[PDB]
Amino acid sequence: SEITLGRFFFERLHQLQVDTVFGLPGDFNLALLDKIYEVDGMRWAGNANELNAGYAADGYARVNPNGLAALVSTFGVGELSLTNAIAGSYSEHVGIINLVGVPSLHHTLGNGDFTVFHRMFKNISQTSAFISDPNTAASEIDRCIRDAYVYQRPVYIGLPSNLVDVKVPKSLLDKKIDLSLHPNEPESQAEVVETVEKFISEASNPVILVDACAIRHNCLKEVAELIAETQFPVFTTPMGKSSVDESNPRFGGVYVGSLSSPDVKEAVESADLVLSVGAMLNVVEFHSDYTKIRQATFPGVQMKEALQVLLKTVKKSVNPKYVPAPVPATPGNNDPVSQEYLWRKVSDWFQEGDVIISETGTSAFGIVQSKFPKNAIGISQVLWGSIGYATGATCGAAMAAQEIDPKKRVILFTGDGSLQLTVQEISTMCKWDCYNTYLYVLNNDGYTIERLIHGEKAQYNDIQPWNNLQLLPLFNAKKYETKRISTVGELNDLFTNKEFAVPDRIRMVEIMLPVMDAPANLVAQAKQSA
Amino acid sequence: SEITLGRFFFERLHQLQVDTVFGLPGDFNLALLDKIYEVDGMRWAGNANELNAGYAADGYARVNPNGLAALVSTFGVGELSLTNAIAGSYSEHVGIINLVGVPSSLHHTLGNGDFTVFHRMFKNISQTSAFISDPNTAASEIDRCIRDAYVYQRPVYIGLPSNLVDVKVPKSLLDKKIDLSLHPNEPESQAEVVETVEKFISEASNPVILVDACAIRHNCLKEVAELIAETQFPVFTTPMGKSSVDESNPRFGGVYVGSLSSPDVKEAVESADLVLSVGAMLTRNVVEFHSDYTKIRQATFPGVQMKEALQVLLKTVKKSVNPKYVPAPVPATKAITPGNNDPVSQEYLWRKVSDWFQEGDVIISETGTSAFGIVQSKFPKNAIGISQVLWGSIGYATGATCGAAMAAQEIDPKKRVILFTGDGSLQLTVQEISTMCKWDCYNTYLYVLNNDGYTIERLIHGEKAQYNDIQPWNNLQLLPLFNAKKYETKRISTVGELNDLFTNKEFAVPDRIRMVEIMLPVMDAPANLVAQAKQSAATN
């Protein structure tokens, strides 16, 4: 009793709750896409373009419980349009199953080299498979999907059209893909734990610092237990924001070196012990595949198991003399709305489980100062920093949220400029009735973050003004609402509006801001960049 | 008296009449972009995204008299977004000067410390590269890369570190123009080619000329016209070469597409005892002039470049024609007249637009029904045809229209730039209409064929499959949403409306940016695409 390899692929996605598939059809993937419809619960997004599909997949993966998403593109024209999306997924460790339909000409570089596109993707892929052999095809799909999950990174699967309809035992699906990690080397683990507990013993002012890899490698429960057991002040990076429940009274804010609110700079940098969890690269750093303790590297000591074993005894290794350290902590209605006011005030509007997406620009710098609710999912592409990403990701994040909980809201802060690069993916949001979605657009008449560092008045920092609020109706939103916010009063009213808080329609809000207005932290970097 | 290397770069573009520069600013190109403004006549497009910038550059290059365009992007996030644009430019031989601003010689990195990773990826879709380091050779390298782009009519990758932008250089360097000229052909090889070709023209009863796109890229259109004049042989183009030959020429027999040709064309070409092919991109009595070499039957003559070869052939080719040869009759356009109130069709549209075109029209057709349709349409004298037949990346046409329109603005305000894009393809690159509105591209006509999704795909596989659906857009709202200063929109549903649109005297004048939505049945297609669809099912 048999299934097509094509169907096998989508069945594996369904098993890992990857129930939305991003990308676009083309000459060499049509036979494969036919198979999504054979798998109960699965939908093809039908993206507005490939780059946006890739951005969507990235957004989806950051909400998907297993941290996975799937892309299907066509040979050459499809894959190369997604290049920058996969690069960013690699950069920030996002588990993308990037499948490309390839031939058994047209969409060629004029030569006869059919691997040229596969070779380009090796630099931004954890692993590849240009699948040929029918006998190993199922195993290879499984192997690639495992690597994506384990290393939390993109993988390239080239599937020739001829191998889509090749028959395979249905029984293969009865054995789940092996997602488990090898156990840590016992002696290396023991040494790490012994040494870490020893330094916690001798510390007077220890702090916990959580970065993004703590999220990717599923250590958020472990991190919460570590805060519980030690009662140490805890902080995140901007890339790691939402790793820690910011409701926790021990949470001290977001560490950004010299760009931190001075209280954060002092609390972190005055510490005699830093317990770093999942840094992206007297200090302890737990990483995915090793542990650093000062200038010593312990190769192979994986962070999840190490933390789990640490938590069994960590409380009783705390200095007996240690006291839980204290942690860091009004305009007119018709005053124009400011960056400073907006990022403070949005804290009051967020709710448990909000997906909160911030584009590179004033938005990403601003949201740092904002306070997230319990079980917030933060998305900010701080490392790769490709503008446009946030709008594509919002599409994927919204479709993932739809599959988890209809009550779960997905909130975007994009600039006017970044919106332009990836605007057509709002189409896809409207196609799938993403009534969970809030598109906040900051209109400051161009590229304000760039104006601050270089070329304040230069024409390259200009953008064509758009009637942005006409976008949702142009893309035929079935049920939608639009608002323009110019004042503190309008913003306050919007954030206490009971109807607006309910995710029952797709919304866009345009917030009018001065050309050169910026959050305090970005004003600081601008001044020291000079 | 000295200039920055940054300014030098833009001065060289000005000298090659590349007066528009496409792409977007980023962390590692701001100091460089400052220099565009120091070079009188030059403008920064400020594109809506990098892929579209790349598509625009491609469109610009296909109108620019030297066949060149310039891109500026930022390290990582900028360049990788343009990858598919540069691949297509490489595929179809378009001369893109793809410059990328890079860090000084840990943000927009793959997390490692490998700063060449993006340069190495672009080598596969670049004729040549320069990751410029040395101040002493920097000017020379820019020059070398720009020459290769022109000579090989292909993209070139220039990585310019931020620190080298403001490095001073003699102004006098600009007094030595970049050498664009080709080495003369080896005289003996050329003589052998010409002697052999003239010998086979002597012995031929029914010879034909077939012109492909490389005849355009390597500036042989005058030579091709003289060859038609001198031989009076029937001449045809490929779809990729359409507009290489003036379709007004009475010796022009139409567009050869193998089995997908109107049967008259199939017979006229395939009955020939001699094919004089000019600039093929790649019966048995065949001569192919290529950029690099000449093929005569089973023999390759390496190094015999096509322009000079043709020029030397034209001096004596007329006197090698059989004296008894009678100019062969050419395919006549075979009549199809529906009623005013009949719904508009693909067949009617592609016949009827022939009557609306005018001397010098830039006519751009997207992959889909449009590209297949425009083949059957008749172009005017000095038409510039743009159809990405080889690479075939949907979205391209809308980006290219932006670049084609800005190039047209620099040549002649009266020169119209006309786009046929599908409803589906439009979605992929829609935001570049913004750039058209920003620069008052009042030369631009955006024809959108609304057939409720991906019709060319529906024809080959998955007629009713959900992947061939697209979200319906209120497409005609696009120009006002992007704040077109002066614009006009029309929806065409009927033969009557289309006829009226094409005799409308105001609409013909390029004094405003226009979009026309043409409503067509889901499965309507031009005859030639209906043919390929049916035999693509035979090959499956």
Ligand SMILES: Cc1ncc(C[n+]2csc(CCOP(=O)(O)OP(=O)(O)O)c2C)c(N)n1
């Ligand atoms: C793909 C890409 N192209 C270019 C850049 C460079 N870049 C960084 S910020 C920015 C402008 C962002 O402007 P906007 O989104 O309006 O934000 P704000 O004005 O609020 O700062 C640009 C062009 C980039 N990061 N990614």
Ligand SMILES: Cc1ncc(C[n+]2csc(CCOP(=O)(O)OP(=O)(O)O)c2C)c(N)n1
């Ligand atoms: C970048 C890219 N993605 C996908 C494709 C595959 N593709 C080829 S034609 C087509 C549909 C185009 O439909 P439309 O523009 O509506 O034209 P129609 O045939 O309906 O007139 C698609 C998706 C491609 N060639 N390039």
Ligand SMILES: [Mg+2]
């Ligand atoms: Mg802005």
Ligand SMILES: [Mg+2]
């Ligand atoms: Mg269509």
